[PDB]
Each structure stands twice: as structure tokens, then as C-alpha cells.
């Protein structure tokens, strides 16, 4: 697999870098690193696809080495360099197109479509050019043990998530107080709220927490905080939990006060923000805590206190919330984002030739289902396949 | 109350109307005006079979006369499932009705008050005292923090300042921290220090008479519309009784069953 | 009937029998000459306090006095949630006794019969012809396939074959699978078609007098002793009394929560 | 690792073929590798234990080659040999502990135990011996991933779970239907029961079936099938499932008639035996179903017609039942017997030094909470410590 980065690097550059006109200084190493290949690569059967409906190809090598003694390339040269390119990228689309669909239980890391395997064998090893993306980068280190790091725009850590819990419940719907979150994405939208805005709550305040569990542990994240969470702040009509009836949501929007965050690694308390907005950074963590309360006001214009009364009624339904945004982040496993198109390139590969639901990964490919369960045979076959969609992605898009 | 967690794409449920109307019992309370002017007696039976065209079984629902508003007003027993109460307006009648409204609209937690021994205090915005009986005449004296009375001398009934007379039942509201003296005429009523919970949501009374003048809410500052007050106009009891089993289906599903662990029991007309 | 799975380590519920006590009610079905020997008066209370001790709140335990087993055995209505019937033998109500206790023990759908205009059969071994009233005297005279009498003239009353004869209440079993009509004193009695269900667990019965000859099985050949029908030796009736209250947690324990979707609403003493 | 199998087999041979008075020609070749082994691990140092109570030891190699020239060994060379066999036993016995005692969750094949790592190695291959153990061979075929397999005898593939589900019920449990079972080591024992006794059934036959899915497909397996469960043949009372009370059953033995059992693999009926009772067998199963019914006895004597009645209260308590030990089987994937002490060995060396709780394996090491869920990195690790544990059983039993 490393053979295979370097294949495709070396045709990236060999395409980008052979070029009418360009001097053979800028081109003698990588015409070496080519001729090489070439070496090596002659004389093989390359057997690729099978599985679904991606054809059954075979490839066969017999290509001339390159000129070397031209001083300043010509078009001949690269015309002859082309014809050979082209089908070298043929190959390695098909290469990496055969290995994206296939999955492992047992050993998700370990090479599978047999082409790729036969290119794993100890012959092809002089292939080893450059390791540089990151993806082929954190593979090398894995093989290597070590840490990992892949940095991330607006990871979709969270699995998407929309549900409500009611800590004070009637039949009616009447009285209610209680929660409401969308997980999603990089977004965490909490609301928590109270129809009698916090009568008999002690002291008028009442206390809202919500518990977000990460499947894994983020590191050096920058977080964007803001208050008054946008989705839960407007009417709604929410089916019960249950399903049996449907209760009505009437938000207004109080500040959520003395609001306080933490981010918890192994359930210890590694950063911690009280009443601090905007932009804040969570060193390592595995969990966030968001709590808030929605405190009464003691004043309050007759508006206001028309708006909340002591009585029975409460046809006004006071809230508080907090959005979380997070914007970058560093992660030790693989993950979609909102940046890089590997994921696209994945669940595109397989759709485009109908390859059966696998043994290990989600029908689809869903990232929900695929990240609210997310065992280490599945991040195996995902950080395998991602980083050969990276790799194929240097030559096809 | 535990927490009761909810996922926000549950597929909303089959309609219940059709469950809930075989599992429950439609409970009418109407005046005996209302059957005089009918000048029949084939009429429950008939609006029975007219309810089972609607849906609910032969034997759901209940039709229970009663005198007059007052007369109603002391010891209301809803003795069945969903409560309707007829109820004609007529002048002068306001705060009675009122009264009456508010009692069975809320939930109330409640003990009883030795009159004649002790003095009594209210807790708070949510705490009355009901009087209920053949003739209920409250007569307060507030008194000071060195008990002895203000407007009124502690011994004197004659210098109390009497909150109602002669009615049959009373929800009197006193100022919320003072220490009052009552007399209350022990033999033809009796006052029980109640306490406000949570809306009774079983009950539903529907004013037949004129404009909108319920407030169950004793506070001057709100005079809240609730949708178990509903308010009908009327010239003849046949069209309101038909209005009303028409709109069943609308009345029923504005009211809802009763939650609320009672510690006392009582004959209720269940299925 | 969905179903329910259900682990065998999960380690045994505390007591429940607290939160039955709290949440149901008692009521005692027993016989007036009960009263009439005690003397007294003050009985109810001084029982209801008993009770008390043994956890039952103050209004949970219901005195339903009835006259005697023969006219409580006319449409029994069982308002409460746990049903004790004090049934005290005396001879040649050997059979109206076991009438009563099948009736009640046992659930039964009932259907109207229209006895002027059709002739009904039995569908099989659950079906009986239940009458109630003030005196019944069923007469039966099986048909043919043609409509024609065989023991008896269809159209001559006199040559009927009577099986009952001025009783409160009658359980027929006739020949299943035979049309028959039914001479039944039309203003007198009621005569329902009834198939027997499951048993009730709500009720007991506490036969008082003689031996075990409660049959509530009509199949000669099964004569099962119920746990649910109880019995013990009297001279007193105190002394029945104390026994029943000293060992109510047993009698309760032997009976269980009624389960059935009922349709025909009726009352109930429940808390 | 196969290098230390390599070494426990050497020593073992060595412990062994190295006697007094044996000629040299039966141990020539064994005294060859024995001086390659003393050879090729001289000066290397070891670095053992270190987790949990295992102390940590450090281990050097400088020792002196067998001699050669002797042409029938005598009691000077056996006991040199014993001097060094000794301390190597000691070496390989620390680093098997270590080995089994360490865990990971990503790449569970790879070594743990640094001493383990280093022996992965490259200049420790001249060591490699043969390969001949069943656990050895599987290992090695897993490495060159092929077709593995694993016999056992009576495996313990089923975790322990005894239950029941009611089909037809009431708050008096007086009249049930339904079906009660105990899933135990390799016995399934499942009884269907009616209080009725198909009274009402239609045609009086009550149908009952019970589906038990295997987490790893088992190949090649003899099943001994027979009726009339023992567990549930014998009156009982059981807390109902909500727990709240208990209910009694008085079971009355009947013949279960037209008994099938299918052996599915992904849910396709790969075998199917109707009415055969003794052994049998099944080629590849992943899933049981035992379907069976309750006939009501068309005739019946007396007795029998007295102890099932038509009416209500049914005294006694009609059931019907099926015993299925799995004998024998093959697996691809490796679990625990009744043959084999590679758990017990694995566990007692874990709870001898109190290892902290891993975050892959469960407590304990419990079999019916570890093969309840059998995730692809659980395999991986049981696997490797299995067959270290056969590796140092092969010395130190
Ligand atoms: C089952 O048998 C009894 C026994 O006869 C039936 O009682 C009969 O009922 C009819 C109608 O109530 C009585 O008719 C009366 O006739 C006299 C003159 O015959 C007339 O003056 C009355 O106005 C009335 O029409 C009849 O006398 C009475 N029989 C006896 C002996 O008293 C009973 O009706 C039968 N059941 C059914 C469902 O028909
Ligand atoms: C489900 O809803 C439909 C309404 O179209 C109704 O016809 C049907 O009877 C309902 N089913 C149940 C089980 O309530
Ligand atoms: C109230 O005052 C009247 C007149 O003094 C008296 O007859 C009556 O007993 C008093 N009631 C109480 C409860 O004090
Ligand atoms: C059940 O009983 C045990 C022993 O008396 C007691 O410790 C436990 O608290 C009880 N359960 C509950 C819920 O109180
Ligand atoms: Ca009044
Ligand atoms: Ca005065
Ligand atoms: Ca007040
Ligand atoms: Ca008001
Ligand atoms: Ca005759
Ligand atoms: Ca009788
Ligand atoms: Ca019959
Ligand atoms: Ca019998």
C-alpha cells in the first residue's frame, strides 16, 4: 500500500513535472525514480475487480525505460511519456477503485484485492519513492506505532442525534421543564427549558445540564460558543416520547446564566469555562459538559411579567440554550469533515457498482450509523480505505 | 417522576379517539331546568344511542341532574370519567358560578380547620378556604402579632368582618399572613384549608348563558381563558344537547384523563 | 397478547403487598343477620380501624350489607377492587349457593335473549342461560328440526319441562346443540345468554357454614377446589370477622387484579 | 511470536531428546539448533514484566554451544544442558506471561510485551524451528491468511443465558403459553409449555420455536439431539419477567411431535433433520432452529383425562422439550473447551498479579460476558493470548 502511494505520486509528479520545454535538471531524479519503476513493474499480471458490478481488467506491463540524454525536454519525449502514463493512471484508479470496495473483519489493515496484495510482495519495495500526505503519513506511523494525528474543518464527530428529555412531565403537556438537543455534524444546539420559568425551582434557578459523549478523543479543538441556541428557539409541535400525542412548544428566550462547560478526558476535568463566549480551545477531551441556568428574572416590565405569570396557565415557555460549533480539531482516528472528499469518494465508489453490504461496515456507508458504532475492525477498514481514496484522489477526480 | 426520554422522529402513533371512546366514560352534569323544558324522558336513552352513533359504548355515558348552580356548588362528586358541566348564567350569579368553576377546574389538596380552638394563617398566593354547606356565613378578625384584633374585638362577633353569607359554598381568600379568627356557624357548614396543585384536567364546564365572565383565577392581575371554559349560546336545551354531542369529539380531545395518586376513595363510573 | 421476555436470575421484587394496600380497596359482602347478631353499631368503625393496623387506609375497607344469598344472588354489582363474600350454608341452598359463587368467581360475557321471538341453542360446554330476578321459573321445551315439540307441545305451557322454579337466580344448562323456548315470566325475570371466560381474580368467597360442596364447574365430572373459595367454621360472627381481618394479607394474597377489557360501565369503589 | 514457539519447542526437545547414555546420532541435529538458539540470543538483553504485580526481570544471554564431539552423552553434557535449559525455561516463561497479561485494541495480533517485540525482530528468524501445533499452524496460517481451523471438543460457544418469553399471559399466570429455555457451554435445552394443553389451539397443536444464533459459524459439528428436556421437566416457580411476582409450573412431559431442527447459515437452511432424534450432523451453521409442536392427546385413559381437564384451572401443566449438546465442531475462530486449558491458563496468569481491567477484554476474563459480544479486536487478542498460552504450555503445565 505504501508501493501503491508511491506509484501514484510518482505519476503525479511525472505529469505534472515532464513537460514540453522543461529543463532535464528539474526531471533527473524523478525520470530515475521512474525508470525504476518501470524496472520494476515490467513482466507482471495485474488482475483487478470482480466484486459487484466493477469489471474484471488485466494489466500488463512491457514499457520502454526514458530518454535521459536530452538536455532540455522536446515534445517527442513527452508524447512517449504520456502514452505511458495514461495507462499506468488507468491502472491505478482501477487499483484503488478495487480496494475501496472490499472490507476485512479480521485485519482490516492488511492489504485486500489481490493486485494490491501482489504489490505489497517484497519485488515491488524499490517502488518506495515518498511518503508525504498525511493520510500515507499517520499509515506509515501506524505501521510504526506511534501517535497519529489527522486535523480536521468541522469534523462530524457527533453522530446525528435530535431528541428531548422531560425531567418534570404531565399527561397534558402542561407544565413541562426539561431538555431538547441536536447533535449534528460539528454542532451541539442544547436548549433546556422551563413552561413555569423557574417558580418553585430553589432560589428561581433552575439547573440544566447535558452530558455529549465523544467516540473519539479530540485534541487541540478550537470551539465556538455562542448562546441562545437557534433551532429551539421558535413554536414547535413535538410528538411525545412515546408517540402517543403531540405537545406544544412556545419558547422565550431568556439568557442562559452562568453558564459553564467542560471538557473531560477519562472523566477528569481537563478544561473548564464559566460565562466565556465566543472562541475557546479544548486542550484534549473525550467529553463536554455543558451546564447552564435558567434563572428568573426578579424584574421585570409588565411585558415580562404578563409573560410569566404564578398561575396555572404558562402559555409562554421560558428557555435558555447554548450552540457549540467545532471548528477545527485533531483526531488520532480517521474522520469525514466538511473539507476533504474521502468519505464522497468512498460511498461514491461503491454505489457507482452496487457493491453488497460488507461484513463490517454500515449498508451505504452511512456516517451516523458508522461513527455511533465505531469498533476498531471498522476504523481499521475505514482509515484503509480513506487512505487509498486520498491516494486515488492524486490522480482522478 | 423520573426522566422520560424522547427521540424527536418517532413516527406519530395511530389516532387513540377510537381506543379512548371505548375505554372511557362521557360523564354529563346538567341542571334539571334543562329536562324540565325537554317535558320527556325518553331522552337519555336517546341521547345515549345518539353518543353510540358518535362512538362510545351504549352504557358510557352518564347523565346526572342537579338542582341549581348552587346547589351543585356544595360537594361537587364527579363520579365518572370525563366530566362535562352544564351550566346556565344567569344574573347575579357570577361569582358563585365562578366559585364553582374554579373548584372543580383545579386540583385541590386539602384538611380540615377546627374553628372554634385554633387561628389560621394561609400560606401563600395558592391557599384558600373553601366553606361548604347548607348556609355558610365566614366571619373573620384579623388579629396582630400579640393576638388581639384589628377592626374587630376578639371576643365580640358582632364587630367581625363578615366575607359571605348565606351562600352555599365559598372560596374566600384572606390577606396572606395575618393570624384570622373565624366564626363559621358549625352546624350548616363546614371550612377545610385548601391548598392549589396542578389543573384538574377532567373536568370541563360549559357555560350556557351569556358573555364571558368565569375567573377562576382569584388574582385580579390574570383572568386567563382556558380551553376546558368553553361557552356555548342557547335558546333551547334540545339544540344545546345535540351541539354538544356533535362536537363530542372536539370536547373530549380538549380534555384530558385525570393524574393525580388520590389517597382517598371514592365511587367512580369507570369501564 | 404480545410477547414478553422475561430472565430466571433477576432477583426477586421487594414486597409489594404495601403498595396494594395503598393503591386498592376492600369491600365485605356479608349477610345482614351478620349485623343483626353483633349487636351493635359502632361495628364498621371499630372494624375500619382494625383494618388500619393491618395497613389498610382509613377508607379503603367497604361494608356491603345484602339480605340473604338467595336475593343477593339477583344481579350482584361487586363496586370495589378486592370483593370478599361472607356466604354463610345453611341446607337446600346447597345448589343457589354454588349458583352465586359460579356467577361471581367466574367471568361470563353475557348477551341479551329476546325469549318472544327466537328459540335459542347452546353453542357448547361454556355456554349457559343465566335468569335473574325477582322469581324466575324458566320452563324449557326442546324443538325439532321442523319447530315441533318433543317431551312437550310448544304452544301448551303445563307440558313444559320445568328446571327451575321460583328462584332469584338460575344457571341452565341444557342440551347443546337443540333449539329450545323459553317460558320465563317476562316481567319478572331476565334471562341472558352467557358464555363463561376465564375466572375473576378480583373476587373470594368465604363460605361460613358446612362442607366443601361448592361446585363451581356444571361438568359432573370436574369438581376443582378453587383457592379463591375459602372456608371456615363459625358459632360467632365476631369471631368470623376478627378471623377475616387477622388474615386478610392471605386472602388478598389468594386473590389477584381483574384483568379485562370491559365494555359495560358500572361503578366502582376504587381509590 | 513464532520465534518463541521456536524457542519453547527447542527446549522442550532439548529437556527431552537430551538424556544420559542416548547416542549422539539421535540429538545431532537437535544440538545444531540448540547452538544456534545459544548463538544468535547471545548478548541480547530482555526487559520482562512491568504491569500489574508481574515483577519486572531483567534477562542477559551469554552462554556456552553443547558440545558435539561427544558420541554417546554422559551425565557432564545433561547436565550443562540442564544448566542452560533452566534459565531459558525461566526466560520464556516471563515473557509468556507478559505477553498473555498485555493487551491492545488496534492491531491485536501485533506483540505486546517489548521483550516479545524486539524477539519480532529480524535477527532472531535463524531461531524458527517448525511449526507443527495445532495453535502454531492456525497462528501461522492467520499470518499468511488462509482457511484456519480449530477442533473442539464440546465447545462453549453459547453464552450462558437461561430465560423464557410467554406467548399467552395474565397477571394471575394461571394459564400461559410459551416457551422457557437455558443456553449453556455447548447445551441447548429448550421447552415449549402450554397450560391448556392445545385445548383451544387450532387442531390441537400448539407450535413453539426457538432461534439460537452463534457469533462465529461453526464447521464440520456432530450434534447429539433428544427429546424431554431435563431443567424444565420438574415443577417450579419462576419470578415473572417485569419481576414484580412469581408464578408456578408443574410440568406433565409430553412427546414433542414432527420435531425439525434447521442449522442456517446466513439465514439460508443449510441442513435439516425432521423427527430424527440421536446424532447428527451439520456442515456450516451460524444459526439453530428448533421448531417443534405440543399435540393434545387425541385419546387418553382416564388418568390423563383427569389430569387435563376442559375447564379453567389446569392443575398440571402440558410441556414439551429438546436437548442438542454440540459433541464436536471446527472453527475458524478460536474458543474455549472442555480439551483445553488456554483460558483457565490465560486467567489464572492474569488474576495471579491482579492485572488492571484492559480496555478490550472483560473483568475477569469472564467466558459468557467476553463471547456475548466477540468483536473482531476481542477475537484478535483472545487468539494471541491463546496461543501464547499453548506456547508456554508446552513447558510449564
Ligand atoms: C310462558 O308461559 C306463561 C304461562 O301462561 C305465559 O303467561 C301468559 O302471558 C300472557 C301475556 O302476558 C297472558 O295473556 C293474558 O290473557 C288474558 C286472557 O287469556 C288477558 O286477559 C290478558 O290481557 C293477557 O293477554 C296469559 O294469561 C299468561 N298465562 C297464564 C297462565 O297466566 C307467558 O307469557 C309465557 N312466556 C312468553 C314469553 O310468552
Ligand atoms: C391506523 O390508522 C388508520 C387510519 O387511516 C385506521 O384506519 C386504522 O384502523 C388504524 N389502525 C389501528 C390499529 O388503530
Ligand atoms: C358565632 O357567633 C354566634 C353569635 O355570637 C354564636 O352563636 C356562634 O356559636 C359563633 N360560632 C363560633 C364557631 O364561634
Ligand atoms: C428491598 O428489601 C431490601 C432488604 O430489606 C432493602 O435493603 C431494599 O432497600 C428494598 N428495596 C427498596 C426499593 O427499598
Ligand atoms: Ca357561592
Ligand atoms: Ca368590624
Ligand atoms: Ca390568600
Ligand atoms: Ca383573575
Ligand atoms: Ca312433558
Ligand atoms: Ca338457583
Ligand atoms: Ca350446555
Ligand atoms: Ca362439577
Known amino acids: 500500500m505504501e508501493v501503491l502511494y508511491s506509484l501514484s505520486k510518482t505519476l503525479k509528479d511525472a505529469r505534472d513535472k515532464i513537460v514540453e520545454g522543461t529543463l532535464y535538471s528539474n526531471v533527473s531524479d524523478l525520470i530515475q525514480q521512474f525508470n525504476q519503476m518501470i524496472v520494476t513493474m515490467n513482466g507482471n499480471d495485474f488482475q483487478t475487480g470482480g466484486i459487484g458490478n466493477l469489471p474484471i481488467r488485466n494489466w500488463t506491463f512491457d514499457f520502454g525505460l526514458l530518454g535521459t540524454t536530452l538536455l532540455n525536454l522536446d515534445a517527442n519525449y513527452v508524447e512517449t511519456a504520456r502514452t505511458t502514463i495514461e495507462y499506468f493512471i488507468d491502472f491505478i484508479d482501477n487499483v484503488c477503485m478495487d480496494e475501496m470496495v472490499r472490507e476485512s473483519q479480521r485485519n482490516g489493515v492488511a492489504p485486500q484485492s489481490e493486485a494490491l496484495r501482489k504489490l505489497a510482495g517484497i519485488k515491488f519495495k524499490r517502488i518506495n519513492f515518498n511518503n508525504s500526505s498525511e493520510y500515507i503519513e499517520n499509515w506509515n506511523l501506524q505501521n510504526r506505532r506511534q501517535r497519529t494525528g489527522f486535523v480536521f474543518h468541522k469534523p462530524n464527530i457527533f453522530p446525528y442525534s435530535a431528541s428531548f428529555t422531560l425531567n418534570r412531565s404531565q399527561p397534558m403537556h402542561d407544565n413541562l421543564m426539561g431538555t431538547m438537543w441536536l447533535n449534528a455534524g460539528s454542532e451541539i444546539q442544547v436548549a433546556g427549558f422551563d413552561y413555569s420559568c423557574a417558580l418553585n425551582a430553589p432560589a428561581n434557578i433552575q439547573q440544566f445540564e447535558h452530558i455529549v459523549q465523544l467516540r473519539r478523543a479530540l485534541t487541540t479543538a478550537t470551539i465556538t460558543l455562542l448562546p441562545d441556541a437557534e433551532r429551539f428557539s421558535f413554536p414547535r409541535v413535538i410528538n411525545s416520547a412515546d408517540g402517543a400525542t403531540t405537545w406544544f412548544f412556545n419558547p422565550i428566550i431568556l439568557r442562559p446564566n452562568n453558564v459553564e462547560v467542560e471538557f473531560l478526558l477519562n472523566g477528569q476535568i481537563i478544561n473548564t469555562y464559566q460565562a466565556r463566549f465566543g472562541t475557546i480551545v479544548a486542550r484534549n477531551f473525550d467529553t463536554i459538559r455543558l451546564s447552564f441556568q435558567l434563572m428568573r428574572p426578579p424584574n421585570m416590565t409588565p411585558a415580562v411579567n404578563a409573560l410569566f405569570p404564578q398561575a396555572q396557565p404558562f402559555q409562554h415557555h421560558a428557555t435558555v440554550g447554548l450552540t457549540l460549533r467545532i471548528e477545527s480539531a485533531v483526531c488520532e482516528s480517521v474522520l469525514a469533515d466538511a473539507n476533504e472528499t474521502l468519505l464522497a469518494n468512498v460511498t461514491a465508489v461503491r454505489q457507482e457498482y452496487a457493491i453488497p453490504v460488507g461484513p463490517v461496515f454500515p449498508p451505504g456507508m452511512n456516517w451516523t450509523e458508522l461513527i455511533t458504532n465505531y469498533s476498531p475492525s471498522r476504523e481499521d477498514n475505514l482509515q484503509r480505505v480513506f487512505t487509498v481514496a486520498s491516494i486515488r484522489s492524486m490522480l482522478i477526480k | ?271
Open chain 2, 1 to 271: 417522576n423520573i426522566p422520560i426520554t424522547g427521540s424527536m422522529d418517532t413516527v406519530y402513533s395511530n389516532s387513540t379517539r377510537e381506543e379512548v371512546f371505548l375505554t372511557s366514560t362521557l360523564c354529563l352534569y346538567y341542571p334539571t331546568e334543562a329536562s324540565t323544558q325537554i317535558s320527556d324522558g325518553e331522552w337519555k336513552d336517546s341521547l345515549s344511542q345518539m353518543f353510540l352513533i358518535k362512538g362510545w359504548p351504549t352504557g358510557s355515558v352518564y347523565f346526572k341532574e342537579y338542582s341549581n348552580i348552587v346547589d351543585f356548588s356544595v360537594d361537587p362528586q364527579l363520579y365518572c370519567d370525563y366530566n362535562l358541566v352544564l351550566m346556565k348564567y344567569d344574573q347575579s350569579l357570577e361569582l358563585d358560578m365562578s366559585e364553582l368553576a374554579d373548584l372543580i377546574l383545579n386540583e385541590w389538596l386539602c384538611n380540615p380547620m377546627d374553628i372554634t380552638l385554633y387561628y389560621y394563617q394561609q400560606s401563600g398566593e395558592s391557599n384558600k378556604w373553601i366553606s361548604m354547606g347548607s348556609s355558610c356565613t365566614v366571619k373573620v378578625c384579623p388579629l396582630n402579632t400579640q393576638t388581639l384584633g384589628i377592626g374587630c374585638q376578639t371576643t365580640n362577633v358582632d364587630s367581625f368582618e363578615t366575607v359571605a353569607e348565606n351562600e352555599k359554598l365559598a372560596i374566600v381568600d384572606v390577606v396572606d399572613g395575618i393570624n384570622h379568627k373565624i366564626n363559621l356557624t358549625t352546624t350548616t357548614c363546614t371550612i377545610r384549608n385548601c391548598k392549589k396543585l396542578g389543573p384538574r384536567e377532567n373536568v370541563a364546564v360549559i357555560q350556557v348563558g351569556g358573555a364571558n365572565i368565569l375567573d377562576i383565577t382569584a388574582d385580579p392581575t390574570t383572568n386567563p381563558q382556558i380551553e376546558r371554559m368553553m361557552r356555548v349560546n342557547w335558546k333551547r336545551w334540545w339544540q344545546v344537547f345535540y351541539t354538544i354531542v356533535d362536537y363530542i369529539n372536539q370536547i373530549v380531545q380538549v380534555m384530558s384523563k385525570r393524574s393525580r395518586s388520590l389517597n382517598s376513595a371514592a365511587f367512580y363510573y369507570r369501564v
